Amino acid sequence: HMIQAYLGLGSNIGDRESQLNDAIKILNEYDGISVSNISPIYETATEQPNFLNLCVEIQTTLTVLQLLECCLKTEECLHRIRKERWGPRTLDVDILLYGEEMIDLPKLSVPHPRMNERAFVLIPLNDIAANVVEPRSKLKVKDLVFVNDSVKRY
Ligand SMILES: Nc1ncnc2c1ncn2[C@@H]1O[C@H](COP(=O)(O)CP(=O)(O)OP(=O)(O)O)[C@@H](O)[C@H]1O
Ligand SMILES: [Mg+2]
Ligand SMILES: [Mg+2]
């Protein structure tokens, strides 16, 4: 049946905003995934560009492992098609939450085990998932989010 999940997307190279918008486009077009909500974008502040990050709410009929493959194929797709002969990767797609489930595999940890210490994740996530419970801490997102001045709305 249909599960609600949250993804975190980040990019700090090229047309960063396009990367993010293209990742969302691709994800929305996999079978078993539809994008139901999108956070605003945030910028986070040595000489390489700042990250843009956002969070995405999806409704999916996929298993969390199938969802992981979709995320990685999306990273892979955008990367392969980059102009620049080599360089740092263009896009990170991380699974933040999958229902209220906890998953501990070598290849997969959900909830993302570092989300709670990252404002560039929590702040955008709080814009679309304030009342969702993070099952490890058993706190809601809105109870975890904190102010961080280095994270600005873009
Ligand atoms: N919640 C999650 N979302 C996505 N990948 C995860 C994950 N938990 C574990 N992984 C695994 O970690 C591997 C690492 O890929 P990367 O994207 O380069 C880690 P990262 O996002 O750069 O750092 P981070 O995990 O601290 O954000 C993936 O191939 C995947 O199998
Ligand atoms: Mg990451
Ligand atoms: Mg990752």
Taking the domains of the chain in order of start, what are their residue ranges?
1-154
Task: Find the residues whose C-beta lies inside 6 A of ligand 1.
Answer: 71-72, 92, 94-95, 107-110, 112, 114
Task: State the amino acid at position 69 in one-letter form.
Answer: E
Residue 135 token pair:
């099952």
> Candidates 58, 69, 94, 104: which one to mutate for ligand 1, based on the most atoms within 8 Å of Cβ?
94
Within 13 A of 66's CA, how many CA atoms are on the CB side? Answer: 9
CA pair distance 17, 41, nearest whole angstrom: 8
Question: Are the C-beta atoms of 58 and 35 separated by less than 8 Å?
Answer: yes
Dihedral sign of CA atoms 99, 96, 129, 147 in order: positive
Measured N-to-C along each axis, helices 16-27 and 64-81 cross at an angle, to the nearest 10 degrees, of: 140
What is the structure's resolution, reported in angstroms to one decimal? 2.7
Please name the method used to determine this structure.
Answer: X-ray
| Architecture label for domain 1-154 | 2-Layer Sandwich (3.30)
DSSP SS3 for 133 = strand
| Helix, strand, coil percent values for the chain (each to nearest 5) | 30, 30, 40
Count CA within 13 A, CB hemisphere, residue 96: 31
Q: Which residues of 51-72 are buried (b: 16+ CB within 10 A; e: fewer)?
A: bbbbbbbbebebebeebbebbe
